[PDB]
Amino acid sequence: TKYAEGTQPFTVLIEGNIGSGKTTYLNHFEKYKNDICLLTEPVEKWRNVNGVNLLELMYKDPKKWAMPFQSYVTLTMLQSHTAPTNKKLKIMERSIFSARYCFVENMRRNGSLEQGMYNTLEEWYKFIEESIHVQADLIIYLRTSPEVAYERIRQRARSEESCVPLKYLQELHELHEDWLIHQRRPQSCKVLVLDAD
Amino acid sequence: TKYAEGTQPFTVLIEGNIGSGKTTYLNHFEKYKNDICLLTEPVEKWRNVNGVNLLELMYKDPKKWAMPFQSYVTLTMLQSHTAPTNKKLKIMERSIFSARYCFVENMRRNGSLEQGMYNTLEEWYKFIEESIHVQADLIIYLRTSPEVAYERIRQRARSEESCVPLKYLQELHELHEDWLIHQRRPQSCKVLVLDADLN
Amino acid sequence: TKYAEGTQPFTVLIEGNIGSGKTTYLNHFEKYKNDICLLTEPVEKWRNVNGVNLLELMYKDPKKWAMPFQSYVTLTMLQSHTAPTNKKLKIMERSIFSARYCFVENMRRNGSLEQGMYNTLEEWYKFIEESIHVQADLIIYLRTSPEVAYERIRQRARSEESCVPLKYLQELHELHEDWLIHQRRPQSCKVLVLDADL
Amino acid sequence: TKYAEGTQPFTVLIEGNIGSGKTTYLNHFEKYKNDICLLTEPVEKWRNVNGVNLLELMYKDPKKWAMPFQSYVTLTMLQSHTAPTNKKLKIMERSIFSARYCFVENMRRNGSLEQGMYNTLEEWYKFIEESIHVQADLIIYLRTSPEVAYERIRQRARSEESCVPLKYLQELHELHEDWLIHQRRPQSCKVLVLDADL
Numbered sequence: 001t002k003y004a005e006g007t008q009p010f011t012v013l014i015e016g017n018i019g020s021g022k023t024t025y026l027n028h029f030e031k032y033k034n035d036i037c038l039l040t041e042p043v044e045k046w047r048n049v050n051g052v053n054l055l056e057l058m059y060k061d062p063k064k065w066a067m068p069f070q071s072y073v074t075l076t077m078l079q080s081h082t083a084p085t086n087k088k089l090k091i092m093e094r095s096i097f098s099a100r101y102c103f104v105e106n107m108r109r110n111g112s113l114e115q116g117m118y119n120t121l122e123e124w125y126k127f128i129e130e131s132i133h134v135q136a137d138l139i140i141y142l143r144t145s146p147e148v149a150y151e152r153i154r155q156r157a158r159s160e161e162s163c164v165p166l167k168y169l170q171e172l173h174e175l176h177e178d179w180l181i182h183q184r185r186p187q188s189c190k191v192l193v194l195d196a197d
Numbered sequence: 198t199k200y201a202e203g204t205q206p207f208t209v210l211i212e213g214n215i216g217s218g219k220t221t222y223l224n225h226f227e228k229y230k231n232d233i234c235l236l237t238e239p240v241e242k243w244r245n246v247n248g249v250n251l252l253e254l255m256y257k258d259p260k261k262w263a264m265p266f267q268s269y270v271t272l273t274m275l276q277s278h279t280a281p282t283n284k285k286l287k288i289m290e291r292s293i294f295s296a297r298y299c300f301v302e303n304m305r306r307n308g309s310l311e312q313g314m315y316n317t318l319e320e321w322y323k324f325i326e327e328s329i330h331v332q333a334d335l336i337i338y339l340r341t342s343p344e345v346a347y348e349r350i351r352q353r354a355r356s357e358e359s360c361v362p363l364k365y366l367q368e369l370h371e372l373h374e375d376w377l378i379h380q381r382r383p384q385s386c387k388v389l390v391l392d393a394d395l396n
Numbered sequence: 397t398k399y400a401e402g403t404q405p406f407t408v409l410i411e412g413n414i415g416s417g418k419t420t421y422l423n424h425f426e427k428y429k430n431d432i433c434l435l436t437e438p439v440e441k442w443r444n445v446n447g448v449n450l451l452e453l454m455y456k457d458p459k460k461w462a463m464p465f466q467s468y469v470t471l472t473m474l475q476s477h478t479a480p481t482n483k484k485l486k487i488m489e490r491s492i493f494s495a496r497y498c499f500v501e502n503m504r505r506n507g508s509l510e511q512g513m514y515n516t517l518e519e520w521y522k523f524i525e526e527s528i529h530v531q532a533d534l535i536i537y538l539r540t541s542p543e544v545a546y547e548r549i550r551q552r553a554r555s556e557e558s559c560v561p562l563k564y565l566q567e568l569h570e571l572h573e574d575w576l577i578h579q580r581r582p583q584s585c586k587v588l589v590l591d592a593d594l
Numbered sequence: 595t596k597y598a599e600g601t602q603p604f605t606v607l608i609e610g611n612i613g614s615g616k617t618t619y620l621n622h623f624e625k626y627k628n629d630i631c632l633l634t635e636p637v638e639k640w641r642n643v644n645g646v647n648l649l650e651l652m653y654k655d656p657k658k659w660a661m662p663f664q665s666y667v668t669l670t671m672l673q674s675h676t677a678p679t680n681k682k683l684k685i686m687e688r689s690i691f692s693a694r695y696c697f698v699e700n701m702r703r704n705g706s707l708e709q710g711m712y713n714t715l716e717e718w719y720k721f722i723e724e725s726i727h728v729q730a731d732l733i734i735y736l737r738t739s740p741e742v743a744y745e746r747i748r749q750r751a752r753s754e755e756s757c758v759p760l761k762y763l764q765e766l767h768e769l770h771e772d773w774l775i776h777q778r779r780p781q782s783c784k785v786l787v788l789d790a791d792l
């Protein structure tokens with residue numbers, strides 16, 4: 001018996017690469033706010049943790065800050081996944097899944113998370129599977145080419161992201177592909193693929 | 198309802214400074230392993246996580262490795278706190294409480310955990326309070342003086358602890374006192390204070 | 397049970413950027429003062445606190461004065477939110493919510509409020525939520541474009557606001573939108589969006 | 595009805611100058627924790643506001659930091675004053691009253707709080723007075739001489755307090771006296787005077 005078990009409605013997760021337009025997509029559901037629990041733009045949380053901008057720290061110094069950043073992401077996802085609601089539908093930008101299967105895996109591959117950090121995160125992930133209910137009935141996948149995602153990143157010009165190369169978006173694209181198209185992860189619910197190009 | 202709620206027996210937590218003799222104290226319950234759930238010596242997990250020595254890394258490079266270390270410690274305690282058991286008594290060495298109120302706080306004060314690392318841990322702690330049941334019926338506090346703790350640490354001579362100064366033990370001591378004697382933490386359960394300075 | 401809880405009639409909040417025409421819009425209800433509790437334009441209070449002009453001090457030296465300024469705003473908002481009335485309707489210019497979600501947040505982002513100052517405001521907001529009932533049934537959002545709000549500010553020529561750039565209104569605009577259109581903020585009640593570009 | 599009205603046990607406030615021994619005195623009630631709501635040593639909060647040491651910022655730069663410092667002290671006192679409890683006795687170290695009648699007043703008199711900052715804090719106090727219930731049935735005054743207070747402060751050697759002059763303890767002593775001995779403040783409940791020079 002996990003925390004939040006039996007307390008959650010049908011849940012949609014909006015996934016896709018950086019700059020795939022997840023927030024822009026979720027904005028369309030604004031009029032329906034009375035019947036949908038909408039939990040959007042988690043990134044504003046990660047830029048302001050009682051004043052501290054973890055996102056900024058992460059990109060500057062990933063070998064020191066990537067583990068607390070991803071730890072804090074994991075938490076905010078958990079807080080959203082388990083938030084109470086009397087509404088019959090919940091829709092969320094991202095999830096604990098993209099953190100684990102995409103961004104944490106990529107940061108291990110590129111070396112920003114050393115084994116000890118990766119290990120600590122994965123052991124947390126495993127304990128979270130045992131202890132906390134994560135409701136997920138549909139994933140909407142906003143699929144893009146790495147190049148379109150990079151354009152939207154350059155256009156948006158978030159300062160924290162000023163040094164993000166195309167290769168990093170290519171790496172992240174393949175991981176989203178591995179999970180959402182090629183069924184290479186143990187999760188595990190329905191997926192609707194949308195062309196966001 | 199929280200995870201592990203209603204699943205846990207009377208639970209005793211053995212607390213005290215580094216080198217206070219917590220494992221030794223818990224050792225004397227071994228002969229009753231079949232009547233008691235004993236979860237002892239968590240430091241052994243921290244020294245080998247799929248081969249990685251987080252304790253050693255923390256001590257060598259706290260500013261990089263203190264956050265992931267405490268985050269792993271928090272996990273191992275939660276793993277122990279929520280462990281299912283068919284016995285009427287559980288006794289554990291340490292708790293999530295001393296990682297939070299003593300070690301994480303001291304690493305904050307000393308600069309080992311930057312403010313965004315500390316805030317991340319604190320935010321995790323608040324969410325753990327909401328989501329995970331931590332059974333705590335009695336705390337046994339092996340109260341020592343920092344000098345006695347320090348001597349036992351030098352005797353034991355763990356390579357990881359080779360550079361630990363007495364000042365750190367004094368800091369840790371006052372924090373255990375603030376929590377277990379002076380009831381300065383929101384945590385409240387019965388405390389039994391033993392003199393752990395003798396033989 | 398909170399202070400003012402169950403004491404308040406249906407309550408409307410008028411919100412919008414600086415210069416968006418909140419007091420003007422509220423002036424239309426003047427003739428109905430006897431059936432409506434009308435609380436406008438709070439800036440008159442911030443310009444004269446027993447003779448101290450805090451709005452002017454804040455613009456001149458924000459690193460020292462932004463914090464007691466927003467603290468006073470918060471207080472005058474609470475005074476209005478909880479002000480007693482035997483009328484069936486209350487209408488108010490601004491609210492505690494815009495101070496928190498728009499003005500305090502922007503002063504944090506621009507450095508006017510150092511961290512300890514922002515933390516202190518936020519912790520107060522958390523306590524106020526626990527202790528004080530803030531009736532909020534409808535927000536009327538006077539939606540303007542930054543350039544239109546800026547022109548009105550220049551036309552008006554309050555001396556306190558003489559150094560306010562267009563950029564600042566652009567930041568405040570995005571924060572009103574984030575709150576009132578995109579509902580990124582915890583507080584929810586119905587919002588009526590009006591075009592106040594004229 | 596004010597917030598927390600009717601929810602509070604008989605409440606004892608422990609007051610005295612800096613270094614008068616309030617925490618030490620309160621330590622004596624530790625064994626009775628299960629029957630007494632004990633709220634001690636609030637200075638640990640003022641030193642770690644999500645990692646920010648407001649106490650240190652105030653002493654370093656009082657003209658900038660004294661206002662948010664006292665604003666936060668006031669909050670913490672309110673959080674304690676209104677904390678729920680099933681216990682039949684509540685004992686708190688310090689109170690909102692001493693922030694207002696002693697420390698805020700002295701920082702006004704020495705210039706650390708300029709008029710508009712002081713005005714903001716006082717207007718808040720008046721609102722708090724109307725909206726929040728503060729239970730206070732007995733004040734225990736640990737009376738000292740400024741010299742004993744000053745010696746204890748030097749001996750404790752808190753880094754934040756290293757530049758604290760004797761004059762400042764003299765000023766604070768007289769304000770506590772004004773309030774707790776000479777009945778100069780609007781507030782009244784019973785006062786128990788104790789010689790803490792011992």
Ligand SMILES: Nc1ccn([C@H]2C[C@H](O)[C@@H](COP(=O)(O)OP(=O)(O)OP(=O)(O)O)O2)c(=O)n1
Nearest residue numbers: 017018019020021022023024043073098099103
């Ligand atoms: N587990 C995660 C999640 C996000 N990020 C980073 C990548 C970006 O720098 C920033 C925001 O990325 P998202 O794709 O989550 O949010 P966007 O605002 O980019 O999404 P969109 O533009 O699609 O609305 O956070 C990260 O490092 N690890």
Ligand SMILES: Nc1ccn([C@H]2C[C@H](O)[C@@H](COP(=O)(O)OP(=O)(O)OP(=O)(O)O)O2)c(=O)n1
Nearest residue numbers: 214215216217218219220221240270295296300
């Ligand atoms: N939250 C924690 C818990 C422990 N430690 C460190 C301090 C020591 O370097 C090591 C083990 O300390 P403990 O007091 O937990 O265990 P001991 O085996 O030293 O206890 P005893 O000697 O009393 O059996 O881990 C830490 O940094 N953070």
Ligand SMILES: Nc1ccn([C@H]2C[C@H](O)[C@@H](COP(=O)(O)OP(=O)(O)OP(=O)(O)O)O2)c(=O)n1
Nearest residue numbers: 413414415416417418419420437439469495499
């Ligand atoms: N929490 C707040 C509220 C207002 N202000 C500032 C912005 C202006 O300099 C002045 C008043 O702005 P308002 O938008 O509240 O009032 P106006 O009178 O400008 O509104 P309108 O022109 O729409 O009537 O106070 C501030 O710094 N912080």
Ligand SMILES: Nc1ccn([C@H]2C[C@H](O)[C@@H](COP(=O)(O)OP(=O)(O)OP(=O)(O)O)O2)c(=O)n1
Nearest residue numbers: 611612613614615616617618637667692693697
């Ligand atoms: N409204 C207040 C209350 C306290 N302080 C400051 C003065 C000291 O620098 C510090 C702590 O003082 P207290 O007298 O409240 O606490 P102590 O711990 O010194 O009390 P004691 O030593 O008597 O237990 O906070 C302040 O500036 N304003």
